[PDB]
Symmetry: D2
Subunit: 30 residues, 4 copies
Amino acid sequence: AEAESALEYAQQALEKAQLALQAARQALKA
Amino acid sequence: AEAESALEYAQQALEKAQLALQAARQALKA
Amino acid sequence: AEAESALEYAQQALEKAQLALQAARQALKA
Amino acid sequence: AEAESALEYAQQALEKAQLALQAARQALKA
């Protein structure tokens, strides 16, 4: 639903973020 | 380019997260 | 250490963001 | 309020995140 779905996207996006996050981290530990 | 660019992508993800969130607090307000 | 560590901090911030968000979708569910 | 405040913290934290984000970025452009 309205906000439900805004959140669900917030979540989803938030995790792609933490995912890109680790990726850079690691690249940097290399 | 793994660190430099994992970074850029992250920020953008965050961007949409930040926006969805803002929409959320609005639907919320109702 | 500015890049390496700005990174760590970021992830953590994200962490609490991700958690608050999850709580939100729960209060939401109600 | 309940979720209102979870969001407000999500937001706040989310921006500290984007803030730490740029910080690392820049350090890396140095």
